[PDB]
Design a binder for this molecule. Structure first.
Ligand SMILES: CC(=O)[C@H]1CC[C@H]2[C@@H]3CCC4=CC(=O)CC[C@]4(C)[C@H]3CC[C@]12C
Length: 260
């Protein structure tokens, strides 16, 4: 007589959150690097900024379909993306470096791979070495794609306003759920000692991104404010993001969340 509103088939066929993360992972983006131009800081940095703007367009499309993110107030979704963008892009850079070059180079894009020489020419050498160190860590830990996709969501949820989000409870719920995903993901089959040791390594890695990202942002805000004198160009997307972030971070309104 009445139509069952529950779908057994639907629940059974719905993919796990981890499988969804794999399904929504953005496709690789090209930098549009032109080797006919000289490899001076002005050109390399402008090209990386253009690449960043293209990558952020895809990050936003990804965030729209990230399981759980839609549950947070809109204002909070926008805020987390703005506070975490540098952590997401630098972590993804190490991932590509790890997968495409065994962490021997920094794989910004298929058409723009930095070797030591480009790192020096970029005038961002020490920062490049810092992102490279994360890539090297991926090799030591043999980071898996599943672990990486969960950690990336955790990074999106790693920095919040000192004040607070519109819904701290909604945020905590999502953050706790994804930490649970990582927790289960590192569970072996049966060996708590090894399982906790790896969870510790992964969370220590996540934590280490805050100091790296702070240094990346210091340099970013610096080149941004002196873009005219330095001739470093930024695409509309980055001007929007940085114009919002710079004052908030510099006034002490960004609060990093740590595991340790
Ligand atoms: C121009 C500048 O200040 C540099 C310093 C840190 C650099 C960013 C470092 C992380 C990064 C990784 C990418 O894969 C795309 C470009 C970005 C997002 C870089 C764009 C250029 C930045 C913002």
């Amino acid at each position: 007589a009445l139509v069952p509103q529950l779908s057994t088939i639907s629940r059974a066929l719905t993919p796990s959150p981890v499988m969804v993360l794999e399904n929504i992972e953005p496709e690789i983006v090209y930098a549009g690097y032109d080797s006919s131009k000289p490899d001076t800081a002005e050109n390399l940095l402008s090209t990386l900024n253009r690449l960043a703007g293209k990558q952020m367009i895809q990050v936003v499309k990804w965030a729209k379909v990230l399981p759980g993110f839609k549950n947070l107030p809109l204002e909070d979704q926008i805020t987390l993306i703005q506070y975490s963008w540098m952590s997401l892009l630098s972590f993804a850079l190490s991932w590509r470096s790890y997968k495409h070059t065994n962490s021997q180079f920094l794989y910004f894009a298929p058409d723009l791979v930095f070797n030591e020489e480009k790192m020096h020419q970029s005038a961002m050498y020490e920062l490049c070495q810092g992102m490279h160190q994360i890539s090297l860590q991926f090799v030591r830990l043999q980071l898996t794609f599943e672990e990486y996709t969960i950690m990336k969501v955790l990074l999106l949820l790693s920095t919040i306003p000192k004040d607070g989000l519109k819904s701290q409870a909604a945020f905590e719920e999502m953050r706790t759920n994804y930490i649970k995903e990582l927790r289960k993901m590192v569970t072996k089959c049966n060996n708590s000692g090894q399982s906790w040791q790896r969870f510790y390594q992964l969370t220590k890695l996540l934590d280490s991104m805050h100091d790296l990202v702070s240094d990346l942002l210091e340099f970013c805000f610096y080149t941004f404010r002196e873009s005219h004198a330095l001739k470093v160009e930024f695409p509309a997307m980055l001007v929007e993001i940085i114009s919002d972030q710079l004052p908030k971070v510099e006034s002490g309104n960004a609060k990093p969340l740590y595991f340790h």
